[PDB]
Design a protein around this nucleic acid. Structure first.
Lengths: 142, 129, 150, 84
RNA sequence: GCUGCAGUUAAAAAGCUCGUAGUUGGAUCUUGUGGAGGGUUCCCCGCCCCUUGCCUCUCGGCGCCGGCCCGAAGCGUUUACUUUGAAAAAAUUAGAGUGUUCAAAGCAGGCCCGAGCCGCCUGGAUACCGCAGCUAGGAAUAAUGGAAUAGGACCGCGGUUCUAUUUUGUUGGUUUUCGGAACUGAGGCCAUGAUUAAGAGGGACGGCCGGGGGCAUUCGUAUUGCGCCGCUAGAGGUGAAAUUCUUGGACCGGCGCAAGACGGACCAGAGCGAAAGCAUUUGCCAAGAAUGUUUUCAUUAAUCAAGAACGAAAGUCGGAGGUUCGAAGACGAUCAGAUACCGUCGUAGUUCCGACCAUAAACGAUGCCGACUGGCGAUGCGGCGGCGUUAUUCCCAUGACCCGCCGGGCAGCUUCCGGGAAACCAAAGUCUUUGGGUUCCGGGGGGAGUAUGGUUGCAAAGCUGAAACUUAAAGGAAUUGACGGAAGGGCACCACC
């Protein structure tokens, strides 16, 4: 309520809504494309890179742990992304200066859990999954 | 100002019925209000009503009962084409069984139930139940 | 309510339903006409004319002893003025304001009130001039204000 | 309000003491009067709210003094209405 | 968030007003009876005046007995709206039929005879298609239309001019005639033509009202300084001090004068102004609200991009002035420290005149206009009435006080009006039973009123205004505890006297 309800006010409605839609956060990222330019991804679900070097990443309080991530440079941008490594002992199955395949966490822009500064994780080392390396139904191909 | 006369009218008789009254005073008397209340009287929601005459525009006085629950206006006046009808009456009525959307057609002012038997669409004015 | 003040108020005249003569009266339609024409010579304008009849003569109003208004009677002769007194009284006021404004440049209150009365002229002019009661080329300016009030 | 009161037929002045444009029919609250003062011996008729000086043709030359309301008479006499 | 959001306090109404575009806008111009279809009046022909408004007619049919009657031809001032037709590629979709082994599909297929029938039967529907355009019917609703400095009606006549090509068998010279068209006078015939005045607006008129504004003028006391007179030792100041002031004498008391500043008490949930704001006297200059009115005009209105006026204090520029207070600054204290709170001194500023600056908790933190819906007592202004007293010439007119009534204005009290998360609010009410008109504005918390470009300004800055990245809370109302160098009571020799 508190607004026009004319019969010839189609212009004053459809131009107002087209302006006040930009104050929404979601809409403003989709249509400016500043999302694409700023992201290390092109909007692609995955991406591929080459390892730079292992790191240890401290946890946010209350939790205290060391989380053993990696840091990676990409093939098609040359810029750098810091990527989590999953389950116990899977760090060892990643060896420095090889290729890897990365993927987002599942929150689509934001850092997940108690680990800060990480927005990406790792899925395949070299056409072989972290699962089959971990479980033992496959072996290192080298 | 008083841009729409009929829209200011119904709110009085709506307010008055709630408090518990049975006589009112509504001004300034449009012909449109008369034929509205005529249809609303036939079905039985209000009683006989007296039109006072003045040269200015007149004044009308109504005798009413608790049968009425609410009569509203719908403004601005949209068109209906007898397939748009079912969508309107669903939103505006408590039930299919009773309630009466009013409208005006070239065949005169009437309820929606009558207009469907004459195959006449037209401009919608208000409602009641 | 008010069109350049915030106020609201009732003081409007209210006429009776009746409208006979009523009975008690005199000066047939024709008598009233010659009674009027004399007054307009003296500079009495249509509003003043009806007052000076209503206060001291037997009329209730000159619309129930004639079939016409006070102004139409004068207009049929050709003795009506070339602009309505309503417009004239607006312009009549604003010249004195402009004089006072030249004599005193620190009366910002007067300067403010002039903007209202000025804009109220232009609105009124746009009624008459669309209705072919004024030339469609006439405008309001300082110069035209001076000459038209004299 | 007792919330059931009649509005068709009002009391002669207990529901016609109201403002004149809030009545069912609009009536004036003014009247005429047939006056014959004893310094201008003529049957003059004058409106109650004079608004202007009413002149006399006799020895006197004033009959009313206008105020904010009903005009008071100088020494005048004889009030009629008549009827309205 | 069109259907369908929110803006007092949770994110949020431009400081305020004017104003074009845009959007929106009062009331008013026709009803009854037989037949036919459906009740017991009421919804295709007609009738009261009208009835699909008219004519004029002429060419090609229908009639009846040369003469006469009625269908088709111009159309009812113009549109929106609504209703009916026409015209719309397929596939897809909806959907009819059909036993794909059932189904997704597909458009097929089904019948009787040993072959000896040389065959039979049947489908491959229908719907939908924003718009805009084309067609026909309706006349309510919403726009638009006419004769008020008259022309509508009839073969009414005159005056004036132009022109048409038909006929006297044909073809040529002439002249009227007829038809069409154009223009002029005086006269009949029209009921001879104006809807009301909005508990809409504008304007006039009357008597009043107000710390409203501008200009001029008048007055009071204090403060400070100066001069003079009198008495003598301290005076200022603070929690306690000290800086500072002082026998050429301060402070204090008395008398006169000068300068600048300022309008006390009276002065109020009082008034006026659009807001910012506005209190000594008197005069002048223009302005405005409310009320009164059987005056005037006749819809002239509401809200508002563009654009425009005013807009506290501080600040900037140029002049005048400079008592008082006083950022800055210099001192004295307090403090471990003390660039502060406190004391002394003191520049800019504070004041006036002329230009700039456009911002505030510019707060009722509450847009403007209109309608409806409780009670009660007051107050300011106008009008109306009165049983009552008083003031003056005994008077009347009138003022003061008393009582009641009617308007509009600042507010209050009261409650199961109703609403709200609650606090609260007769509006923040009449809202899932959602639509009176219209403008502005909001979308978790930060980043940030920052970055950047535009624009305005002498300067100071104002207006316009992002993102990367970061985070799961930020925030509102209310309740229970604890705490308080908060308030009121009471109590203890593990507290004090």
């Amino acid at each position: 309520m508190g607004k026009c309800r004319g019969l010839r006010t189609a212009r004053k409605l459809r131009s107002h809504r087209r302006d006040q839609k930009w104050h929404d956060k979601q809409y403003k990222k989709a249509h400016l494309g500043t999302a694409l330019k700023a992201n290390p991804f092109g909007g692609a679900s995955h991406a591929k890179g080459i390892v730079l070097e292992k790191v240890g990443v401290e946890a946010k309080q209350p939790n205290s742990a060391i989380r053993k991530c990696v840091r990676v440079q990409l093939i098609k941008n040359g810029k750098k992304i810091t990527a989590f490594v999953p389950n116990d002992g899977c760090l060892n199955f990643i060896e420095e200066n090889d290729e890897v395949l990365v993927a987002g966490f599942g929150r689509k822009g934001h850092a997940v859990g108690d680990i800060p500064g990480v927005r990406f994780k790792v899925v395949k080392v070299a056409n072989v999954s972290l699962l089959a390396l971990y479980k033992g139904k496959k072996e290192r191909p080298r | 100002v008083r841009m729409n006369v009929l829209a200011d009218a119904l709110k009085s008789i709506n307010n008055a019925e709630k408090r518990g009254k049975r006589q009112v005073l509504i001004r300034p008397c449009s012909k449109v209000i008369v034929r509205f209340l005529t249809v609303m009287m036939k079905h039985g929601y209000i009683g006989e009503f007296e039109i006072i005459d003045d040269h200015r525009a007149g004044k009308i006085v109504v005798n009413l009962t608790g049968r009425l629950n609410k009569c509203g206006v719908i403004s601005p006046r949209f068109d209906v084409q007898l397939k748009d009808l079912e969508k309107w009456q669903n939103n505006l009525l408590p039930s299919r069984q009773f309630g009466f959307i009013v409208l005006t057609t070239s065949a005169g002012i009437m309820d929606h139930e009558e207009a469907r038997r004459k195959h006449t669409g037209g401009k919608i004015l208000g409602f009641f139940f | 309510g008010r069109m350049h003040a915030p106020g609201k108020g009732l003081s409007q005249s209210a006429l009776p339903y009746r409208r006979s003569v009523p009975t008690w009266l005199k000066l047939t339609s024709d008598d009233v006409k010659e009674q009027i024409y004399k007054l307009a010579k003296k500079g009495l304008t249509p509003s003043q004319i009806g007052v000076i009849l209503r206060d001291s003569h037997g009329v209730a109003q000159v619309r129930f002893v004639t079939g016409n208004k006070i102004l139409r009677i004068l207009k049929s002769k050709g003795l009506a003025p070339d602009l309505p007194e309503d417009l004239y009284h607006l312009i009549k006021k604003a010249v004195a304001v402009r004089k006072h404004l030249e004599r005193n440049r620190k009366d910002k209150d007067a300067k403010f009130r002039l903007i209202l009365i000025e804009s109220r002229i232009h609105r009124l002019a746009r009624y008459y001039k669309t209705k072919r009661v004024l030339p469609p080329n006439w405008k309001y300016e300082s110069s035209t204000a001076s000459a038209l009030v004299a | 309000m007792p919330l059931a009161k009649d509005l068709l037929h009002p009391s002669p002045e207990e529901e016609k003491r109201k403002h004149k444009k809030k009545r069912l029919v609009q009536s004036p609250n003014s009247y005429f009067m047939d006056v014959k003062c004893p310094g201008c011996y003529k049957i003059t008729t004058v409106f109650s709210h004079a608004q202007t000086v009413v002149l006399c043709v006799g020895c006197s030359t004033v009959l009313c003094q206008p105020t904010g309301g009903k005009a008071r008479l100088t020494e005048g006499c004889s009030f009629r209405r008549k009827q309205h």
